[PDB]
Amino acid sequence: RIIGMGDRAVEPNIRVRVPFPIDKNISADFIICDINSYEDQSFESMFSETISV
Amino acid sequence: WHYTSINNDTRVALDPKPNQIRTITKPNTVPQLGTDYLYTFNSRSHTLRLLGPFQYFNFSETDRGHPLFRLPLKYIPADELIDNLHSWMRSVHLLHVRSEDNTLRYNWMLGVYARSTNYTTPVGQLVVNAPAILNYSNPQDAFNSVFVALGIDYIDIPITNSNIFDDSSTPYNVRIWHAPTMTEVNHILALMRKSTLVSTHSSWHWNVLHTFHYRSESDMIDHFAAKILEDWRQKEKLDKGALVEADRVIQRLIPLSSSTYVQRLAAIGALYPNEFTENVLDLSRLSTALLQLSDTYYQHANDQLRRLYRRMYNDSRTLYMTQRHQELLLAQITADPNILLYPYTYIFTTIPTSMNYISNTGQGRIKHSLTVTGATEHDTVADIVLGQTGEDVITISMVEPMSIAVEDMYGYVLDTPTRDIWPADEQIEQKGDAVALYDTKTSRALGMFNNTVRIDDLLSPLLSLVYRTYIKGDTMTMTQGSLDHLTLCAAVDSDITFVGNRMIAPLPEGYIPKPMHRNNSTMKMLSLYVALKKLENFATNSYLMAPDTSIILLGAEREPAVNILRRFNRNVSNVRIIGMGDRAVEPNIRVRVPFPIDKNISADFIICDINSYEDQSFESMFSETISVVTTCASAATRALVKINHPSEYMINSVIERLSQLGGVFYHTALLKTASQNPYSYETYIYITPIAAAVRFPFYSNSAMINRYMTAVADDEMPIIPSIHTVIKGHSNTYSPGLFCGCVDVQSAPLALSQLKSYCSEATTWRVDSDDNLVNIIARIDPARIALEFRTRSNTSAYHEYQRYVPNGLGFKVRKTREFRYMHREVTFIHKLMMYALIREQISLTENMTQVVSIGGRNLADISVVPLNMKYVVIDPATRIETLTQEKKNIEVQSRPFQFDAANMDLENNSIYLFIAVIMNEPNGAATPARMQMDKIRNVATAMLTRTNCVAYISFYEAGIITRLDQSTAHKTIGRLKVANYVPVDTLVEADVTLMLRDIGITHEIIRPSTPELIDACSNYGIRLGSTGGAVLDVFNHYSPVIKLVRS
Amino acid sequence: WHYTSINNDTRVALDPKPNQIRTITKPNTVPQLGTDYLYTFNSRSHTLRLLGPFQYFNFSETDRGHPLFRLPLKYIPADELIDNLHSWMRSVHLLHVRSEDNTLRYNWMLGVYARSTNYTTPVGQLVVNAPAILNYSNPQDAFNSVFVALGI
Amino acid sequence: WNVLHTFHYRSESDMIDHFAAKILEDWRQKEKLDKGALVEADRVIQRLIPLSS
Amino acid sequence: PVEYGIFIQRGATYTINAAGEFEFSGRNEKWDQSLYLSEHFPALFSDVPLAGANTIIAIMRLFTPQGFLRTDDLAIAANFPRASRNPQTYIPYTNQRGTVTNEFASRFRTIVATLANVVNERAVQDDMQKATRSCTKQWLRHLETQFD
Amino acid sequence: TVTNEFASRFRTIVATLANVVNERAVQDDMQKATRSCTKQWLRHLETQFD
């Protein structure tokens, strides 16, 4: 099984906002994580996003 | 940021050298094309297009028709046009003078065009007498000489077409004016007013001004938009900072004397709308959707963004550069003095900034995962009605079909007896159970799941397409293997001849030997023959037998199952496959069972299936079923009989009618198989000539037998799923099913921000870019309804979904089929059967304070009964905040629950759930602690009206070791590999009850039964997994829910 | 026992959407058949039969003879009829109006038949002047309008 | 469509061959119904009714 | 007839939508002179390339005029009445003052060269005796050489 | 109707009936002038019907 999640994810891939909500039950053995959204915000808003991912 | 770029003439540096211009036209004779001229061919189409230095070249009408294109198009061979285009390119030259000076460049553009008209025009007649007039050392000075030596003010050249075969009329024609100084440019541009429809754009190539002249008004906007697209790309790389080369800085055309549509089109191009991320509906037809966006910026959106668009609509005569865009001209004007630019300019810093948007123009239906929380407050909304599905776009079928492997088509699960005595008091009690049950048939609600779906019905469409692969296609088959006999059976009506064990030889020359015709009762017993040879001995790889042994099939019928079984052993010597039946046609022998004395039946392996017939008293029913077994036990050595209604009386009386009769008694073991029709409650009794004396012959508890012993009479009725096509905001009461339809894209976000109250999964797609309809598919799930209609706060996240409209909900062509029943495995099905039991217990008791669950993903909140009752979850790992904050009345204490009996305070109305016990974290393996922690779990209980449920895993032997069907839930050595984790230690059941008979008080182990199977299968509308169905009924039993409900 | 069943119109849910009816007839130009139209051939026999949404469709006698079937039957190559049936299905359309409302369904049965007779009949001549008469949102109401506006 | 529509036959002989082609179909719809399953054939009874005949 | 029903399928006439390409009407109308000074065009001159019939469209790019818009100064330099924003005309010929073999006539040869090829395809279906098919191909030689 | 329908059906009759006539002028293999003069008659006969 090769599943993919994204903020700009189209069928077949599942569209969801990260951090994702409670429930849904994500589970795997190996996770590759690339998130970058988005430009412009205060380091305070920038720090909180990068650390939580 | 001020972007960097290099600005340099692209066309000027394309014109070849005068003394070398000889080669690049005629002496192209010696080489032969191939790579340069590009040609693609879609299939009535094509596009032959020769490029530099043969692009921007217009064709003489004499040399256009004669040499080539007209006839070669009329057909292409990739060998024709390569040899043929050469034949034309051979006979071409330009009137020229060979020079000595290295600082000279030949003038192509004007020179070639003059030859194309046979020099009839004076501008071409001038180049005849003195062809050295084309040799220029400096741009602009090339044209200047062709004006002073004529007295003419301007020369106009008709445009060149890159496509060689699109021989149609030109859209526009360019015009070159004589203009040397700067004060001259201002004269032509000012005189250019009051004159039809003309265009110029920012800078110029050769330092001479040249304007565009359009034929009809309609053929202006299509060219004006083809430029405006290009510019929007040049300012993309510039806005980020890179290296560009497009000489001019601004590609955008400037409308001088023009119509009215181009005013609305010019202003909407000179501001670079955010709409990139495009959305915009850019692809086609572009001159329409762009023209709609002009009206947009206008009346909305927005403040001074209207004021700016309305500051350029009324003006439409100056090009609007954007600060750093203007500086690139300032950086190059000082780099070289004496260069012409558009004089009237406006510089503006105010853009400014705003929202982001999102879209894609790709393929694929987009999946969604809606939540119950957001940043908007929803109060009293409409009812978002949707209608009409159609039959071509959305197809709905009630099935569903599955896809698996090859060997797992066959999968037997064996079961073993437990008791050694059949008491004289419970033998008449068991009798009363089977007698009272027989009269009122099995649940009607269970019925509409037996005769509805079928094994062969869903397993057989696949094996008939692995048959197709076979026609010409196959590899090594290798004899005996689960592939050999199967592709031999299902795939070919004729015989599969074997050449050197493994190869398939050859191909069906012209005869397609009609696909071996299958039937329902045949795949039924195709699954059991393998299991019989399997039960003989665990050693893999046989399927064919040591020759001169005869297997006899008893049935049923005048049909195959024997024709298939025979020709599998066609290759190996002399084997006899005989069949008997009450409805048996030649070749098969017709006879009534029990058969008469004489005839002398004899075999080594007997398969027995008899069922005739419906309606009769249990007294007539008992006598028939029992006598068939006795006329089978003496007929063979290794014989297996098929008994209906495995009720703990009927089944146990069978052993009671074989033991006493047979010397040395007999070894019995009933079994379930794959390819049995998911839940058919029919089991198969297996009979073998012991070894000595059996220790536990009879059946005490009887669990597989119990699966039949849980069905019941009429009551409510059929339930069933349907369609809806209407959504009400925070309004409960929706019968299980799914709703499909279609809504306007302008109200599509409003639809999604309401489906969250009913489901989680939703798919949406627009048929075509410019349609406006987005059909939605949503599945009603009760596991979500319990977490929505909790309180009253609707909230939702309307703001987020609204960022998709228009394009962003996906695009999809073709037909798509959504099933009525979906597909789901057994581990989340076994939990679905687990909760349907527990939901019954808690919605019956008197008073409760809270229902407290320990461990998990937050999921399994379903069975929080009622939806109002406090719901406490004690686990170390979970997402908190918003859900507990949005007064859905939840709380999660992130302490790793310490069940060491040191500090316990469950108390009065406390309902506890222990689905864990495996570990505090993901994996645990302490069985004395599983006994001791369960010992200190019930220890310290004086908390009045409290209750708690705990789960187990035990058995081992019957369900895996003698199983040989390691599908999903397999086991290793004493370890149980369910799903993942790391195989949990099995617990001794006998000790766990015995150790509980002194410390605690109440301990009831309730197994989830068939009512739980139907009810959970009805709401979610999920099929049973067939192969998983055979694991389901055995694995379901040995996970008892021990409920310690005491004071 | 009282049996359970789902009862729902099968033909009604076959008629395509008005703004999309464009594609499922002419713009079938870009793809090329293959699976839909079924054809078996026993051996002097055969049975070429195109299905939904081209079943229940009656042939105009002008476009029936000219494009295809009469000569191709007279022989089949599995490469002929695939390329050849395309040549006919290319040159077919139904007089229609592109709509904006999502709750509309195009009326196939009556509409296609009227075109098959060159609108010579008044029931077909009515759909010429105002082709928006075929756009119905509710069954029964589709035919009702083709009676009040005729007196038939 | 919720509007009544009747059949008109050419010759008498070409009536019984169509009337029997329906009556066969019905005998199948009441087979799955008699046992209990999931059908979709909208109308319940396929059998044709002879008015003037 | 095999691909005429593909041409007259898309429309006999068409209009031009506000800022964009053409719009063919699915109707099959006969042309009248009343439509000229109002709206529409004979679509047998609309030169959008078709996907099927490439023969009906091939004989139509054979009607293309050979001239140039010679805007005249000496009429307006003399100060004369002109109703349009700027004056314009369309003369139908060139000059070929120094060309060895006249150009205008050589274009006519291309018309006869391919138009005669179409005539043969009728004397294969009606398969006339060669003397009939020859006597018509011979006439186009005289007709063309007169034009020179 | 632009071109009358009833007459266009008649064209299909001539179109295939004339094809049958050719199969007799291959077995008796008449000089083309004979086979042409009968195929020419069906053109006049059909155009009158219009």
Coordinates of C-alpha atoms in Angstrom, one line a residue, chain B residues 72-288:
Chain B
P72 CA 1.8 15.0 -50.5
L73 CA -0.8 16.3 -48.0
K74 CA -3.7 14.8 -50.0
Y75 CA -2.9 11.3 -48.7
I76 CA 2.2 10.1 -44.7
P77 CA 5.3 8.0 -45.2
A78 CA 8.2 9.1 -43.0
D79 CA 10.4 8.3 -46.0
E80 CA 8.4 10.4 -48.5
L81 CA 8.6 13.9 -47.0
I82 CA 12.3 13.5 -46.1
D83 CA 13.2 12.8 -49.7
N84 CA 10.5 15.0 -51.0
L85 CA 11.1 18.2 -49.0
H86 CA 14.7 17.9 -50.2
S87 CA 13.5 18.1 -53.8
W88 CA 12.0 21.5 -53.1
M89 CA 14.7 22.9 -50.8
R90 CA 17.2 22.0 -53.6
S91 CA 15.6 24.5 -56.0
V92 CA 15.7 27.7 -53.9
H93 CA 18.1 30.7 -53.8
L94 CA 18.1 34.4 -52.9
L95 CA 19.5 37.2 -55.1
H96 CA 22.7 38.2 -53.3
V97 CA 26.3 39.6 -53.5
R98 CA 29.3 37.7 -52.1
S99 CA 31.2 40.1 -49.8
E100 CA 34.7 40.3 -48.3
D101 CA 34.1 42.4 -45.2
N102 CA 33.5 40.4 -42.1
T103 CA 31.3 43.1 -40.5
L104 CA 28.3 42.6 -42.8
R105 CA 25.0 40.8 -42.3
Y106 CA 22.6 39.7 -45.1
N107 CA 19.0 41.0 -44.8
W108 CA 16.7 38.0 -45.0
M109 CA 13.2 39.3 -44.0
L110 CA 12.8 42.0 -46.7
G111 CA 15.0 40.3 -49.4
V112 CA 13.3 36.9 -49.5
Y113 CA 9.8 38.4 -49.6
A114 CA 10.8 40.5 -52.7
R115 CA 11.8 37.4 -54.6
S116 CA 8.5 35.7 -53.6
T117 CA 6.6 38.2 -55.8
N118 CA 8.9 38.0 -58.8
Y119 CA 10.2 41.5 -58.2
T120 CA 7.1 43.0 -59.9
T121 CA 6.8 45.5 -57.1
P122 CA 9.4 48.4 -57.1
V123 CA 10.6 47.4 -53.7
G124 CA 11.6 44.1 -55.3
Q125 CA 12.6 45.6 -58.6
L126 CA 15.2 47.7 -56.8
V127 CA 16.9 44.6 -55.4
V128 CA 17.2 43.2 -59.0
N129 CA 19.4 45.9 -60.5
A130 CA 21.6 46.3 -57.4
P131 CA 21.3 43.3 -55.1
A132 CA 24.1 44.7 -52.9
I133 CA 21.5 47.0 -51.3
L134 CA 20.7 44.1 -48.8
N135 CA 24.2 44.0 -47.3
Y136 CA 23.9 46.0 -44.0
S137 CA 26.4 46.4 -41.2
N138 CA 24.0 48.1 -38.8
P139 CA 20.2 47.5 -38.1
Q140 CA 17.8 50.3 -39.1
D141 CA 20.3 51.4 -41.7
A142 CA 19.2 48.3 -43.7
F143 CA 15.7 49.7 -44.2
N144 CA 16.8 53.4 -44.4
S145 CA 18.4 52.9 -47.8
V146 CA 15.2 51.2 -49.2
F147 CA 13.3 54.5 -48.5
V148 CA 15.7 57.3 -49.7
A149 CA 16.2 55.4 -53.0
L150 CA 12.4 55.3 -53.6
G151 CA 10.8 58.4 -52.1
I152 CA 8.2 56.0 -50.4
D153 CA 7.2 56.6 -46.8
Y154 CA 6.4 53.0 -45.7
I155 CA 6.7 49.4 -46.9
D156 CA 4.1 46.8 -45.9
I157 CA 4.8 43.0 -45.7
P158 CA 2.1 40.3 -45.5
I159 CA 2.8 37.9 -42.6
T160 CA 4.4 34.5 -42.9
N161 CA 2.7 31.3 -41.7
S162 CA 4.7 28.6 -40.0
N163 CA 2.3 25.8 -41.0
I164 CA 2.9 24.8 -44.6
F165 CA -0.5 23.3 -45.4
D166 CA -2.9 25.8 -43.8
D167 CA -3.2 27.7 -47.0
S168 CA -5.8 30.3 -45.9
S169 CA -6.0 34.1 -45.8
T170 CA -3.8 36.1 -43.4
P171 CA -5.3 37.5 -40.2
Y172 CA -3.2 40.7 -40.2
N173 CA -0.4 42.5 -42.1
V174 CA 2.7 44.3 -40.6
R175 CA 3.9 47.7 -41.8
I176 CA 7.4 49.3 -41.6
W177 CA 7.7 53.1 -41.5
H178 CA 10.7 55.2 -42.2
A179 CA 11.7 56.8 -38.9
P180 CA 15.3 57.7 -37.8
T181 CA 15.1 60.1 -34.8
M182 CA 13.0 60.2 -31.6
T183 CA 11.0 63.3 -32.6
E184 CA 9.9 61.3 -35.7
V185 CA 8.3 58.4 -33.7
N186 CA 5.9 60.9 -32.0
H187 CA 4.7 62.0 -35.4
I188 CA 3.7 58.6 -36.8
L189 CA 2.0 57.5 -33.6
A190 CA 0.0 60.7 -33.3
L191 CA -1.0 60.5 -37.0
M192 CA -1.8 56.8 -36.4
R193 CA -5.0 58.0 -34.6
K194 CA -8.3 58.2 -36.5
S195 CA -7.3 55.2 -38.6
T196 CA -9.3 51.9 -38.5
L197 CA -7.7 49.4 -36.1
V198 CA -3.9 49.3 -35.5
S199 CA -1.4 48.0 -32.9
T200 CA 2.1 48.6 -31.7
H201 CA 3.9 47.0 -28.7
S202 CA 6.4 48.7 -26.3
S203 CA 9.7 48.2 -28.1
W204 CA 10.8 47.3 -31.6
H205 CA 13.3 44.8 -33.2
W206 CA 15.4 46.5 -35.9
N207 CA 15.4 50.1 -34.6
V208 CA 12.6 51.1 -36.8
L209 CA 8.9 51.4 -35.8
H210 CA 6.5 48.8 -37.3
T211 CA 2.7 48.6 -36.7
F212 CA 0.1 45.9 -37.1
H213 CA -3.0 46.1 -39.4
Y214 CA -5.9 43.8 -38.8
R215 CA -8.4 42.6 -41.4
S216 CA -11.7 42.3 -39.5
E217 CA -12.5 43.4 -35.9
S218 CA -13.2 39.8 -34.8
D219 CA -9.7 38.7 -35.9
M220 CA -8.1 41.2 -33.5
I221 CA -9.1 39.9 -30.0
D222 CA -7.7 36.4 -30.8
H223 CA -4.2 37.9 -31.6
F224 CA -4.4 40.5 -28.8
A225 CA -5.0 37.6 -26.2
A226 CA -2.3 35.4 -27.7
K227 CA 0.3 38.2 -26.6
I228 CA -1.3 39.0 -23.3
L229 CA -0.9 35.3 -22.3
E230 CA 2.9 35.4 -23.1
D231 CA 3.5 38.5 -21.0
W232 CA 1.8 37.0 -18.0
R233 CA 4.6 34.4 -18.1
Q234 CA 7.6 36.8 -18.6
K235 CA 6.6 38.6 -15.4
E236 CA 6.5 35.2 -13.6
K237 CA 10.2 34.5 -13.8
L238 CA 11.0 38.2 -13.4
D239 CA 8.8 38.4 -10.2
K240 CA 10.8 35.6 -8.6
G241 CA 14.2 36.6 -10.0
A242 CA 16.0 34.5 -12.7
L243 CA 17.5 34.9 -16.2
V244 CA 15.2 35.8 -19.1
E245 CA 16.1 36.6 -22.7
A246 CA 12.8 37.8 -24.2
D247 CA 13.9 41.2 -25.7
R248 CA 11.4 44.1 -25.1
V249 CA 10.5 43.6 -21.4
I250 CA 6.7 44.0 -22.0
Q251 CA 5.1 41.7 -24.5
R252 CA 1.6 43.2 -24.0
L253 CA 0.2 44.8 -27.2
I254 CA -0.9 48.4 -27.1
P255 CA -4.2 49.3 -28.8
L256 CA -4.0 52.6 -30.7
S257 CA -7.0 53.1 -32.9
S258 CA -9.3 50.2 -31.8
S259 CA -12.8 48.9 -31.1
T260 CA -14.5 48.5 -27.7
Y261 CA -13.9 44.9 -26.7
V262 CA -10.1 45.4 -26.7
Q263 CA -10.4 48.2 -24.2
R264 CA -12.1 45.9 -21.7
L265 CA -9.4 43.3 -22.7
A266 CA -6.3 45.6 -22.4
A267 CA -7.1 46.9 -18.9
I268 CA -7.6 43.3 -17.5
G269 CA -4.2 42.3 -18.9
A270 CA -2.2 45.3 -17.5
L271 CA -2.5 44.4 -13.8
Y272 CA -1.6 40.6 -13.7
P273 CA -4.7 39.2 -11.8
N274 CA -3.9 36.9 -8.9
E275 CA -5.6 34.1 -10.8
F276 CA -2.2 32.3 -11.0
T277 CA -2.5 29.8 -9.4
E278 CA -4.5 30.0 -12.6
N279 CA -8.0 28.6 -11.9
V280 CA -9.5 31.1 -14.5
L281 CA -10.7 28.4 -16.9
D282 CA -7.5 29.2 -19.0
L283 CA -7.3 26.3 -21.5
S284 CA -10.2 27.0 -23.9
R285 CA -11.5 29.0 -25.4
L286 CA -9.6 31.7 -23.4
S287 CA -10.9 34.7 -25.3
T288 CA -14.2 34.1 -23.5

